[PDB]
Amino acid sequence: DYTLTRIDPRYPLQKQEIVTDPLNVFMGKLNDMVNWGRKNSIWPYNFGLSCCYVEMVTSFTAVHDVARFGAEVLRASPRQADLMVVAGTCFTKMAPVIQRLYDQMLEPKWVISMGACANSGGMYDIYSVVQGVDKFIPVDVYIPGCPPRPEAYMQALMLLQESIGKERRPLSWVVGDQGVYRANMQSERERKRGERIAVTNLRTPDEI
Amino acid sequence: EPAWQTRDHLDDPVIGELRNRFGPDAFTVQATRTGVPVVWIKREQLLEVGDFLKKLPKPYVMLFDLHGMDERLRTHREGLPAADFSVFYHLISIDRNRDIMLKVALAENDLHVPTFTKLFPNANWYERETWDLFGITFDGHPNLRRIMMPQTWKGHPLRKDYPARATEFSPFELTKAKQDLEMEALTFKPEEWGMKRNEDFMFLNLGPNHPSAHGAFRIVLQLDGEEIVDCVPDIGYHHRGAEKMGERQSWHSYIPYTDRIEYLGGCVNEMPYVLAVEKLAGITVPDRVNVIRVMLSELFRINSHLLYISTFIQDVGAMTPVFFAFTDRQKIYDLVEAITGFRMHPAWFRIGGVAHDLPRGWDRLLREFLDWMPKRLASYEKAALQNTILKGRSQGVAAYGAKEALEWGTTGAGLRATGIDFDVRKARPYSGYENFDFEIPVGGGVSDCYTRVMLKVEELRQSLRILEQCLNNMPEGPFKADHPLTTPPPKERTLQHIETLITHFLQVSWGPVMPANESFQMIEATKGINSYYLTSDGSTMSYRTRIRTPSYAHLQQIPAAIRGSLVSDLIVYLGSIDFVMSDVDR
Amino acid sequence: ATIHVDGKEYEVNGADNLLEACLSLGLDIPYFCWHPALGSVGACRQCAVKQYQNAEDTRGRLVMSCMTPASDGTFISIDDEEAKQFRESVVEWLMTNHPHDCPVCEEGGNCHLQDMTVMTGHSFRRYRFTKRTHRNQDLGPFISHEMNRCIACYRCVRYYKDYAGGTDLGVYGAHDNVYFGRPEDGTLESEFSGNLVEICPTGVFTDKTHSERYNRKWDMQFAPSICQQCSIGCNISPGERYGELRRIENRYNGTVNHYFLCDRGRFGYGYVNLKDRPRQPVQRRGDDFITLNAEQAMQGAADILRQSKKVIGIGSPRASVESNFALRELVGEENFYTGIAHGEQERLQLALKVLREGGIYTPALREIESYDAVLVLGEDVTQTGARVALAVRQAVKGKAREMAAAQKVADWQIAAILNIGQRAKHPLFVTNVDDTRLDDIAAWTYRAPVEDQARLGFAIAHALDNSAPAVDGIEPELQSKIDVIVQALAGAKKPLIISGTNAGSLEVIQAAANVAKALKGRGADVGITMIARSVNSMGLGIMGGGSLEEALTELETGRADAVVVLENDLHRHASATRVNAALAKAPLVMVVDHQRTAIMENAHLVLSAASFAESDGTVINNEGRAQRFFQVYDPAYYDSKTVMLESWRWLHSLHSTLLSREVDWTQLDHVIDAVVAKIPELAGIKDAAPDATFRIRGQKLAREPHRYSGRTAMRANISVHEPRQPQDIDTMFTFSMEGNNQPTAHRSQVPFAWAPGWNSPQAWNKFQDEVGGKLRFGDPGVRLFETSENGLDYFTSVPARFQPQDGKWRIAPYYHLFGSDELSQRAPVFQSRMPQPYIKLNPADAAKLGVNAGTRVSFSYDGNTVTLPVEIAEGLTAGQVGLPMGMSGIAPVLAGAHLEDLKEA
Ligand code: SF4
Ligand code: SF4
Ligand code: SF4
Ligand code: SF4
Ligand code: FES
């Protein structure tokens, strides 16, 4: 129920294989402590592409307060950032810039596609748009929407936190196994199918 | 006579003046639904006509638009000169409150026009875009390089034989050699951009990743110490191909793409497109539709102005009004979600009306917003806008007069801070804006950053007044016109009448058939003047969709106004323009 | 003639009515009850315009443009307020009883009534009362019936009865309860009943075979193609969705098959969607069937073909010109054998010699309708070349047409034409072994064996011209009928002689050639039409080669140790046991085919070829016109494992791998140029269609409409990433909507008809130069040969009369439009329409054998005893037994053969 990824510099320059979860009880507790610290302090790269970035900085404001999750520092440097939110369209002139900024980020790093443009190109199936940011960089969380509302971005933040909290990474670069192990978690569609199909009645659209 | 009727405008005094000056056989008058006199001028007389219009007793002082059209696939070209391509020039005389559209016909092999930059400096970027997207060469241009697409691009995207969709092309593969080659193309070289370089002129790179809400873009700066001796903006990093999608989507299905032209505008962006399509369809919307569209336009205008003022204050250095202004944006978003069901891109305007009726309880939410807003605005002024540090950062920074605003096509608050009282809602009224009592604020004559910001505050207050008038006087009636081309028809008649079901079936599947004509609508957007110029060839898709945006003009006006200033002055000027890069590139 | 429409002057034809003249000018007038092929009746009252007496007139009067001639100096208005109001009122009256059915209607998005409701501007309903309803009928497996949607425009009855000559469809009832259908539930008996799905402007008659896997018109990927189910070569528009051939529409060709197809072409396409088709190359290794891709298939096939001492190739008339030529280049000209029998090849080459050397013009399918007398010798036209039978019916009604023309009645006023010419008709004389479907309009029918039909033709030619060989032994009654035929044919300005190779007799073709030569020698404008068997029978005959029997002897003698069979099952052209033994003896059998045939069990290699829906190519129809068919869809778009290529691509890659050990596939224009360079008789196929570099102002031609949907969801279950659009390097069409399909585009190949405001098949009016005429820039297709300057000589081989010998039964051929074709029986929707396999017997022969109707009798052919039930055929001559050709187990080469020990089982 895990995937093993090791990188060695077409993009992405990684190869993944399905592997059994390896997990002493002290090493496991240290791994959960490291994962807890990584998931409760996630610093996003302040990267503005399009309208989805306007919704992201709406999520950062007072009526939403994304600071409650410890994800508010909003670094302008990719070295100091933990999370790349592709919040906008992957234009062909901007795609090498996105690749360069993602390369300049440091491990551990995670990617959230925010919006239909970053997911698959969205409505812009046009000559000057890369059809999704997963064509050239690996994505951890996808948010459908055009735009997603700010609480959808927070929901993806919680999904990323839950994905980090059960993934395995080396504690030190001199001791252990240096490959990155990511959990193959259950899809949210199959998890929410029980509560979504049973919905019967909704409020009529003629009211407030 | 309805306002959508086809007119040749032979009663315009400019037509008689051109008859007396150049002769009757020199040009062809075209009857359109654009509302403007369209004159097909021969190519060798184009600069003469431009000089004559610039030297009129009430001169045509502003080049509103300049672009091209591929006429090869156009079947209904009756009463028109023979052409494979054409170049159109939209020129505005503010003193007459009139405008004229010159058109130059071009063959497929001889695709060269004399340049228009000696008369209007905005023709630089307009002709660069026309060369980039249509391949039309302009003789005498200082630098005719691509402005939207990279320099290593093959073909011109807006030609009719160029495939539109990315799925037509190969999927995007990023290899090591491809990444190196595209990173080499984005590198700046002083000689190619016409910098015209002293052993001290350093070069500065601003973008293309941009820590602000208004898009991602580059500015390359030539510096003597800290002084900006020259600069040229690099745009096209936000190009979405929206006009090519206008040729690719039907009339009804293009409205979501019209939403994302200026993504802080929403229904303000939807308004000129649906007005131009209703001109093409011969649809006069009822008064309730006009009041609803005015109300939503003013709501989104207050949203955009709140974001602009908050972003300007944040760029000065005070970071709290962005939190409070986004709370006010959340109140506006509550009302907009209640009415349309979406926050930023409602796509709620329709050909002939709006998608739904107003929900029960809209007046309550509008009342809460109208009670909430003015105290918050006064707190914004007292906390940040009257701060002397903000005034020192803003007043006197990147200032220009009426002549520089007129020659560069600057509209909106930047034009009106020069003292020129020119708002579309009062000069060329649209969508029943003549029934609303509101004032147009103007400046003293100098367009500082602070003057533009205070003007946008004043238009926020006037939009609050318009919203109060909309709340007090909303007519009872239909939310959709009774025209046969109202797309889509009212939903319940579609659900129980077979003829209405047929109309809806054909309008949402194949599209509604607009008769072959040309239409034009310009509106006062949240950031200036936004216009749609729509050419229909009689089909269910647009033959040509031309979207004129003011942010293009303001980004082109940047090097003339920021020259000889500091880099922080450039940051303040960027924060005080009220642009977005989707508006620039689209 | 000069007309003035809305103040604008137009030059039109004064013989036309105002509706077709105004539609030819590009003006839009709504209409329901008028059809270009059917004429004007003035029923629906939808085409109303306002006519003025003179130029200075303001009142005017509402007239009907279909019923008003477009005479010189006419003044009309379409956009007049009263005319617009009346047209909207007519649409409203039609909409009072219409069901709320558009989402669940197969005509939705393809509906003429929808287009005319939108065009008239009627979108508000104020009728508040009830709507009339009708029960539906079961009209068979092909046509679905829904009478609630009818607007009582009488197009169906007019087409089916006046044009198609059918009998079982009619109008019943009264004032507003008019019902259109059969008198009782049952299958529609017309061979052209499938055209009702395009004739009906509503969804009353619908394609049930399409209604099974239904998709809308905007979701279809269309191509211009040629129907492969017989030799006529009707132009079709196959439309595909989700990797299966969904529908066949009539593609307008004003020279061939203008508005109408037959039922075999319209509903016999189901073999393409069979699940047992080969989709990958398969190699047999003992009991193992290894699936390969194309490269290792070519490598292995190249090694086994290079190790062989002599390779032979057996073509087929099913395959295109390019594929047969590629096989001929792979195996050599001397080692290339046509896949047909020796007798079939002899009849086909004689028909070709008559067509391109007899000095007599061969009419096109549309040109057949302008002939003054028709003699059909041997060919059951309705069951083999059905559209020729429809054109024969039109030529027969030409006498009523000219009788009405003699009374100054316009040619579009069809009711007056049919009233004047009540039952008078042009002479039609049909010969067969039994009754035909042309017997209701034939002046005479001769039910006789093929030798007797040939003798009748020879006697007709001798009586027309005494230089022709005479026939001795003609009965006085037969001589009187011959005199009647001769007196009819001699007095005809344009006689037409129709024969073919399906009769199984060389002497029938010789007699038809003699009749045509005798009519030509008298100065008449005689035309001759030969009906071949398969789609590219004429092309295979022009290319030539040995027969199937010679290839079988080459396999059996051991001189050929490798055989490549291209798209041929080989059991329809020879006995199955001999073919199986000869193929089992050969150490290498390679079958290049798109259908799972019976000889693939013995095949060492099977190449998954493409059908007409997945391939481009050229086919030569029965008149010698080369026609290019284009690929409809990429098979590998959905199933990425599917390796299914064109047959000429397979064989050219095989030839390249055999010669130089490298795999080069081809481009299609390279194969076309190779055909033109090597075979000068097939040099006309270059000009059949323009090459792959042809563009309309720089862009390609679109295969699918501009509102094509689902592009980011059609393949989303396989992969969420959108794949590369399929590239078409072979032709000028693209597998996308990013192309040109303008009605004014300078081209001849139209994949589908669509215009803004015209979503129905009435957009072909926008795609024509004048409505009902040709395509605007010429119809596609080019005749391979012109008429020769000098003709043939008289065939002196007059056969002896048919003598019924004891113990031997002459096999009289019976053809069926549903069942005789090789590929159409594979279509699962045909098995309900395919007849049961009987055998026909004379009453005297049945009484001599002591058998009744329905009992089973067994006969042995080539040492194979098979049993069949019996019908009693009254018209069948004694000494003959009637077998249905092309059926399950009955090969078409059995026609004209003899039978032994035919006795009751
Ligand atoms: S998904 Fe929609 S809201 Fe987000 S960047 Fe794209 S167009 Fe803007
Ligand atoms: S026949 Fe036409 S109008 Fe009637 S239900 Fe079908 S699509 Fe609708
Ligand atoms: S069934 Fe169809 S073709 Fe026949 S009268 Fe009714 S609408 Fe016309
Ligand atoms: S007549 Fe022959 S070619 Fe024409 S549709 Fe029928 S089967 Fe096809
Ligand atoms: S088309 Fe003329 S009345 Fe029907």
Ligand SMILES: [Ca+2]
């Ligand atoms: Ca192909």
